[PDB]
Amino acid sequence: MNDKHPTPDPAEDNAFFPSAYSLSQFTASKSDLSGAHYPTPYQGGRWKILVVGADERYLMMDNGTFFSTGNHPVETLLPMYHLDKAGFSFDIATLSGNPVKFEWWAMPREDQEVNGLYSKYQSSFRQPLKLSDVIETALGEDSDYIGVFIPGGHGALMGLPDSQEVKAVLQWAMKQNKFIISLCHGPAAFLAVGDDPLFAGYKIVAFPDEMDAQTPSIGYMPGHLTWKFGEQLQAIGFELLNTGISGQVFQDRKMLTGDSPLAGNALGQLAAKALLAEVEQ
Amino acid sequence: MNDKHPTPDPAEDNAFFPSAYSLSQFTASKSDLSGAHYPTPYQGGRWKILVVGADERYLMMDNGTFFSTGNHPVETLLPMYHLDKAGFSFDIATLSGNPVKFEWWAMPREDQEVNGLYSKYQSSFRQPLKLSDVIETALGEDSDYIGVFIPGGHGALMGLPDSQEVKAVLQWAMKQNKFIISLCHGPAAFLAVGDDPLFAGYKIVAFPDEMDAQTPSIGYMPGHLTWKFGEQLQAIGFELLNTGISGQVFQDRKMLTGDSPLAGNALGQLAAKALLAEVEQ
Q: Do residues A79 and A186 make contact, with C-beta atoms less than 8 angstroms apart?
């Protein structure tokens, strides 16, 4: 209950879920989903959003242990919920084609709506598209994709940050003036552009590095991140606006971002309003 | 409500480990590692062996559930142990670069030697090389690899069976007349060749499709496989020799294969014998 020791994961050797204690403070049986009401949604049947998810669950800490993480279910499904009520479909992909990995210990087991939306897309989450395929066939200048969504969760720190494919997707999004939606640790994917001065000047909100440096103190993670995504993003032009977290979000042109596992709902509202305004015109 | 019902895995939703019953029958606290001493081993320090492991653990069954699989620890470590004692070194790799996945419910916990070999390479398994990087710098006519080992476990049925990177590796191995070593469901990876009749006429042993159709009756899997790797291999020219399993190993030129989780030791012996002769002129 009050136990702060990391909790061992039976599936992997030397891997741990967050501590029972960190779990009682950072996870809840229900989400704060609300406002997903769009009286006049898009009904074109065309525009859909491409979801790029984490495909690995075990993240290596600075002490040799594995953090049992992945994408955050609340951060992932709340935004998808709003966009769904808005009238948008989703295509789900990972770098390897392997199943999308969620931090189930963060899933609100009592949220009917959140579990409802998930049931609807489980087949896609569990049998995703291989990103390389989406790139070779579903992008270009006349894509049915109106935006790209990269959910948070430390699982977003593996693969995506230095992937040549994610880079093509981002470059496409920026070149075809498409919406890029992310929150928490999701912006780490942006580092994929490597040395491209593509995002120079952009303003985003993202989980604060200083907080990652503190969470292990209560056994949230079995150790510390081997690097800090926040400084890297900054290194390539991004202006991180938030010093702390509050579930806030920001829009810089078509770049929409949330600051933490508290920003899901707000992001879903923002993306919804921004996209509905894009298409209703 | 019974010991033959699949065992829930807390890390993945709707995924299961084998049932308690199947585990007591198909796994052991100790392995049968034996005859691993080589009086006159290799001492050159060059010849190395490339391991291509599983990066995914959750395999989709026909009923929608996930079988919590991965590489088989005994099929993996018994061959490595002999080759380690024979004087050879290893390079461990996965398609994506992500951690190698073992079916930890099969690891013989009371076995010192095997647990010792695992701890020796633990950092390579947890942080392996990415197969693309190997193909781009460690192959060729002057490669230090004297062979390629593709361990079994139903985890080898994902990604490997149709990976271009893997096709490249297998053509290299054949092209360069290197050793190809595999067992159980490992030969599934051979399918990465697709159309190429590169293996026409080759004889091997592998886990019978027939048995994959039976093990679920006792809860070894939470469902049935959605395709048969045996019939597939036959489709591209291989001749599967065993109708059952008994630890049988086979050698067709430089193709070395085992038929089941019972062929680990026998395969380590064969590979070490075959390879030591290969390094003496």
A: no
Rounded distance between C-alpha atoms, residue A190 and residue A186, angstroms:
8
Closest residue in B to A64 (Cα) is B123
Q: Give the helix ranges, DSSP H, for chain B.
A: 20-26, 73-85, 112-126, 131-137, 164-175, 209-212, 229-235, 264-278
In whole angstroms, what is the distance from residue B146 CA to residue A125 CA?
Answer: 40
Burial class (CB in 10 A: 0-12, 13-18, 19+), B226: exposed
The residue type at B171: Q
Check CB contact of A126 with chain B, cutoff 8 Å.
yes
The resolution of the experimental structure, rounded to one decimal in Å, is 2.5
Distances (CA, A) of B237 to B93, B200, B201, B232: 27, 4, 6, 9
Domains of chain B and any CATH numbers: 1-281 (3.40.50.880)
DSSP percent split of chain B into helix, strand, coil, nearest 5: 35, 15, 45
Query: Which amino acid would we find at residue A143?
Result: S
Residues facing residue B251 across a β-bridge? B256
Experimental method: X-ray
Cβ-based contacts of A101 with chain B (< 8 Å): 12
